Amino acid sequence: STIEEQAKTFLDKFNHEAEDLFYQSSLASWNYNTNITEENVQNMNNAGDKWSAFLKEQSTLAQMYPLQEIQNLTVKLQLQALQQNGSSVLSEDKSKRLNTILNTMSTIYSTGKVCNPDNPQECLLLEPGLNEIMANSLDYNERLWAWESWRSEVGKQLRPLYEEYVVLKNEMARANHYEDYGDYWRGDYEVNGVDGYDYSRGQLIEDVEHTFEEIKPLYEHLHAYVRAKLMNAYPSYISPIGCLPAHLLGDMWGRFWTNLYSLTVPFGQKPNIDVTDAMVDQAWDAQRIFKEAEKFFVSVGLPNMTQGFWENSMLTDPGNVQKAVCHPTAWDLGKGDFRILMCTKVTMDDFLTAHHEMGHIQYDMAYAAQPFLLRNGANEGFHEAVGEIMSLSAATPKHLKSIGLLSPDFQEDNETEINFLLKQALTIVGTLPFTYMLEKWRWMVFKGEIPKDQWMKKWWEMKREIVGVVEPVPHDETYCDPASLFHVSNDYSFIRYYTRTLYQFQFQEALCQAAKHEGPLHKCDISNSTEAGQKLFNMLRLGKSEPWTLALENVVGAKNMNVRPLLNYFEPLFTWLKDQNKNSFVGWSTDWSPY
Amino acid sequence: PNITNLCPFHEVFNATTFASVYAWNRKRISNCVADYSVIYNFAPFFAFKCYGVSPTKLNDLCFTNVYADSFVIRGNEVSQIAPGQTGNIADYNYKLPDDFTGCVIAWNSNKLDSKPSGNYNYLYRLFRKSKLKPFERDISTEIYQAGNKPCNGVAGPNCYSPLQSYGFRPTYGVGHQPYRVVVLSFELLHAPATVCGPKKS
Ligand SMILES: *[C@@H]1O[C@H](CO)[C@@H](O[C@@H]2O[C@H](CO)[C@@H](O)[C@H](O)[C@H]2NC(C)=O)[C@H](O)[C@H]1NC(C)=O
Ligand SMILES: *[C@@H]1O[C@H](CO)[C@@H](O[C@@H]2O[C@H](CO)[C@@H](O)[C@H](O)[C@H]2NC(C)=O)[C@H](O)[C@H]1NC(C)=O
Ligand SMILES: *[C@@H]1O[C@H](CO)[C@@H](O)[C@H](O)[C@H]1NC(C)=O
Numbered sequence: 001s002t003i004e005e006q007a008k009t010f011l012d013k014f015n016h017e018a019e020d021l022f023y024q025s026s027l028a029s030w031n032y033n034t035n036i037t038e039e040n041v042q043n044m045n046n047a048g049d050k051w052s053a054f055l056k057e058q059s060t061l062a063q064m065y066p067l068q069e070i071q072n073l074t075v076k077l078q079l080q081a082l083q084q085n086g087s088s089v090l091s092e093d094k095s096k097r098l099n100t101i102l103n104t105m106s107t108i109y110s111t112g113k114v115c116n117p118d119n120p121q122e123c124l125l126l127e128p129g130l131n132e133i134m135a136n137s138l139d140y141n142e143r144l145w146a147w148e149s150w151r152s153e154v155g156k157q158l159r160p161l162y163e164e165y166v167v168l169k170n171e172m173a174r175a176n177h178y179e180d181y182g183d184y185w186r187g188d189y190e191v192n193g194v195d196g197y198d199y200s201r202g203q204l205i206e207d208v209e210h211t212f213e214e215i216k217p218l219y220e221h222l223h224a225y226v227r228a229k230l231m232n233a234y235p236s237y238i239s240p241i242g243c244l245p246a247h248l249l250g251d252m253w254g255r256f257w258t259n260l261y262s263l264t265v266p267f268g269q270k271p272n273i274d275v276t277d278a279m280v281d282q283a284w285d286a287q288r289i290f291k292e293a294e295k296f297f298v299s300v301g302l303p304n305m306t307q308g309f310w311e312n313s314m315l316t317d318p319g320n321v322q323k324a325v326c327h328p329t330a331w332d333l334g335k336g337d338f339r340i341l342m343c344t345k346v347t348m349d350d351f352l353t354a355h356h357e358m359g360h361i362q363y364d365m366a367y368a369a370q371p372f373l374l375r376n377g378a379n380e381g382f383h384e385a386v387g388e389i390m391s392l393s394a395a396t397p398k399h400l401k402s403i404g405l406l407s408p409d410f411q412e413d414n415e416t417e418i419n420f421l422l423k424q425a426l427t428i429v430g431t432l433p434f435t436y437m438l439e440k441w442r443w444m445v446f447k448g449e450i451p452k453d454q455w456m457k458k459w460w461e462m463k464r465e466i467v468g469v470v471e472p473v474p475h476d477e478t479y480c481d482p483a484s485l486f487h488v489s490n491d492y493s494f495i496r497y498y499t500r501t502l503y504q505f506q507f508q509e510a511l512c513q514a515a516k517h518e519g520p521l522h523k524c525d526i527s528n529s530t531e532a533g534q535k536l537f538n539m540l541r542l543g544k545s546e547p548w549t550l551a552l553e554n555v556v557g558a559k560n561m562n563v564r565p566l567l568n569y570f571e572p573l574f575t576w577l578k579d580q581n582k583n584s585f586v587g588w589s590t591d592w593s594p595y
Numbered sequence: 596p597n598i599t600n601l602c603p604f605h606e607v608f609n610a611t612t613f614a615s616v617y618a619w620n621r622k623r624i625s626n627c628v629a630d631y632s633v634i635y636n637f638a639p640f641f642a643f644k645c646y647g648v649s650p651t652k653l654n655d656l657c658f659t660n661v662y663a664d665s666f667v668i669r670g671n672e673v674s675q676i677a678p679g680q681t682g683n684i685a686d687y688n689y690k691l692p693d694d695f696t697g698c699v700i701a702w703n704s705n706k707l708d709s710k711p712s713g714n715y716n717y718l719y720r721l722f723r724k725s726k727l728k729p730f731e732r733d734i735s736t737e738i739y740q741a742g743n744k745p746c747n748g749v750a751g752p753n754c755y756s757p758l759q760s761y762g763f764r765p766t767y768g769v770g771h772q773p774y775r776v777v778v779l780s781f782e783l784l785h786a787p788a789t790v791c792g793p794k795k796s
């Protein structure tokens with residue numbers, strides 16, 4: 001009779017038909033991903049079309065319920081999620097142009113082929129070849145040619161496209177009652193209406209800044225050490241007082257530094273903790289890898305895997321005749337159906353990745369009871385954080401000696417710990433300034449703080465000032481150097497990686513103090529601790545029903561992002577880096593002294 | 596005397612077609628011998644909860660009427676077929692009284708009630724003006740008027756058809772698979788009790 005009861009009944013109808021149509025859509029997406037055939041393509045397209053049609057009509061019917069007179073938080077959250085007009089708020093011409101722009105950016109990025117001059121008979125694509133050269137080669141001019149050529153071609157062909165893209169997305173956000181597209185992206189972390197746990201869209205930028213200001217000493221020491229080792233690798237091109245050359249970071253863009261373990265190893269004589277050999281000696285098939293992951297999750301207290309998980313998941317590559325997408329993905333079909341699509345091989349990596357994806361599925365299982373539109377992570381960072389904590393705990397020497405992959409007489413000396421922490425630092429601490437810089441550039445270009453004719457000059461300046469990476473040659477506004485990355489060319493939010501990185505170590509400290517760990521944080525394992533599994537499960541079951549600040553308070557006892565667990569995780573490496581940077585100069589200069 | 600005229604339990608727990616929970620089927624059982632052992636050995640049961648009588652004493656007890664109520668629900672709702680429970684099924688589809696004397700029996704029926712395109716012939720009532728009284732059935736398809744404006748019979752905004760379909764599929768999770776439920780209700784009246792068990796010599 002009142003608006004709130006009408007909203008409850010409408011949400012009940014929506015939840016029922018949403019779960020049915022979503023299940024058909026997800027089953028068709030699964031059938032395309034495990035069987036790439038044209039009838040599966042058209043089935044997936046028809047199911048996706050019927051789902052987007054349903055979510056359109058239902059959003060039209062959902063906007064007749066104003067939110068200011070609904071007092072229940074769950075109903076308010078579901079209606080806030082449903083009433084979003086997305087790209088439909090524009091005119092038909094502008095919406096069609098926006099979808100055309102997005103599609104052509106996707107096709108330029110996916111089919112972008114850049115090759116050597118004077119040899120045009122065949123050319124090299126980004127995904128098969130450019131990642132290899134930019135991640136394995138030790139030649140300066142070869143990496144320079146690939147880097148400059150790809151950014152030159154893709155930037156010249158994508159700069160007017162991005163020029164129209166920023167305007168259309170800004171109009172979309174401002175028609176949707178947001179300040180800019182950056183505010184629209186920051187709206188995922190927004191919490192309104194709960195006392196004490198309130199979080200604003202605008203608070204995220206200063207929280208990220210406040211964490212990064214404490215990230216900066218550790219990153220500076222790591223940068224100095226990496227710089228010194230790269231100076232050993234490249235003798236005259238890199239300056240002691242300057243920044244790193246951009247095409248020497250191990251990736252195409254400098255996003256991850258994990259490709260520099262070979263050049264920047266602390267102790268090359270010591271081996272790593274690779275346990276691939278023990279798996280291949282003991283004949284560990286994919287099934288037993290997932291069974292060991294299941295045993296870990298039942299050891300910590302979480303539920304077993306469902307029968308339909310073992311029956312319906314494709315945990316091995318099917319063969320040559322039947323083609324499937326090889327990307328590791330955890331699927332929440334709904335209707336109690338949870339699957340993992342993983343082309344598992346026998347490696348230490350795939351084992352850790354199986355722990356990661358089963359962490360994703362455990363997160364999806366805990367929140368299943370929740371209503372359909374609240375079956376997600378509390379924010380975009382939690383879902384990957386709860387998988388990365390499992391990848392953290394499973395890779396420890398204690399856990400590997402517990403399950404028999406690592407010998408019981410294995411000596412954990414400090415040198416292999418330094419080696420492990422530096423590999424983890426190159427993967428985790430290395431991506432933080434790049435992520436913060438990229439998101440802050442995107443936020444200012446959406447906000448209009450950066451002028452249109454000053455894009456590259458501002459971007460490179462921030463790369464010199466924040467990341468400590470210098471450009472090889474100056475670039476004018478004919479180039480669109482940010483857009484060479486997959487996430488920015490294809491309209492994806494990027495701050496999730498920064499938030500996930502911080503939430504990962506926060507969750508890890510909370511579970512390790514829950515499980516009574518008496519050593520350094522990097523050695524901690526949450527196996528056989530049911531109080532830690534209970535502590536985590538109290539956040540997993542919530543889903544998106546509660547604020548992400550409340551879920552964070554449920555696990556770590558704090559309601560805001562904290563950087564103290566991350567720096568506490570890398571504390572022995574921080575002391576070691578302080579010890580070996582006595583002769584060298586910590587910090588960088590923004591001058592072009594290397595190049 | 597010779598044992599004959601056994602009660603037709605093989606026609607309740609083994610029908611080619613069960614009923615939707617909104618129009619749940621009720622069969623009265625009288626003037627026959629109650630061989631509950633066939634019920635026992637008829638499938639592995641997800642729940643054989645008996646409220647008020649013990650599962651064994653049944654055969655040696657003699658009741659006046661036995662009501663067998665048969666329907667199909669989803670696994671998550673099997674807990675709702677009990678005294679004192681709430682949900683969509685308990686409030687709007689099938690209600691047991693708080694002093695219920697009888698047993699509830701449920702078993703999985705994926706091989707019989709699940710189709711891959713979706714079995715859309717099992718329905719349940721999602722919207723009802725008031726909660727159901729015990730042992731009541733509503734077969735009405737009247738458009739549920741959830742708002743203030745009259746619906747006028749045609750489905751439209753704030754006007755929802757009350758019977759929603761249980762789209763059963765074989766790949767669903769255990770909590771969503773079709774479960775066939777038979778509820779045995781025993782009643783005694785002033786009339787001579789004519790449903791008792793077998794006798795031996
Ligand atoms: C989503 O789009 C619809 C359609 O434009 C918006 O509905 C209109 O809202 C304005 C502003 O209150 C009203 O003056 C119109 O009468 C509404 N039209 C209809 C058909 O309802 C809706 O407000 C938008 N919602 C959001 C969150 O952007
Ligand atoms: C968690 O508990 C299990 C079960 O108690 C431990 O597994 C045992 O480890 C001891 C180590 O000496 C063996 O002798 C037993 O045979 C093991 N039992 C089983 C059933 O595997 C396990 O080590 C504990 N710790 C961890 C980190 O998993
Ligand atoms: C993959 O698709 C083909 C299409 O003809 C079909 O024959 C085959 O059975 C499918 N494989 C699986 C595992 O469903």
Ligand SMILES: *[C@@H]1O[C@H](CO)[C@@H](O)[C@H](O)[C@H]1NC(C)=O
Pocket residue numbers: 008072073074075
């Ligand atoms: C919100 O509604 C749900 C059912 O839709 C109910 O369980 C919950 O208690 C309600 N919350 C409040 C604060 O009334």
Ligand SMILES: *[C@@H]1O[C@H](CO)[C@@H](O)[C@H](O)[C@H]1NC(C)=O
Pocket residue numbers: 298304
């Ligand atoms: C499921 O978990 C229980 C304990 O939680 C365990 O006893 C049982 O063996 C597990 N199931 C399988 C198939 O291992």
Ligand SMILES: *[C@@H]1O[C@H](CO)[C@@H](O)[C@H](O)[C@H]1NC(C)=O
Pocket residue numbers: 414415418576
């Ligand atoms: C490792 O421990 C030994 C023993 O005290 C010490 O001499 C050595 O300096 C340590 N090395 C590092 C890298 O911590």
Ligand SMILES: *[C@@H]1O[C@H](CO)[C@@H](O)[C@H](O)[C@H]1NC(C)=O
Pocket residue numbers: 605609
């Ligand atoms: C019970 O059902 C099965 C299913 O096929 C059938 O074979 C059997 O004959 C049935 N028994 C009775 C007594 O109806």
